[PDB]
């Protein structure tokens, strides 16, 4: 699971 990318694109 990469909450990142839930901060890169959202």
Given at each position: ?10
């Amino acid at each position: 699971g990469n909450l990142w990318a839930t901060g890169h694109f959202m």
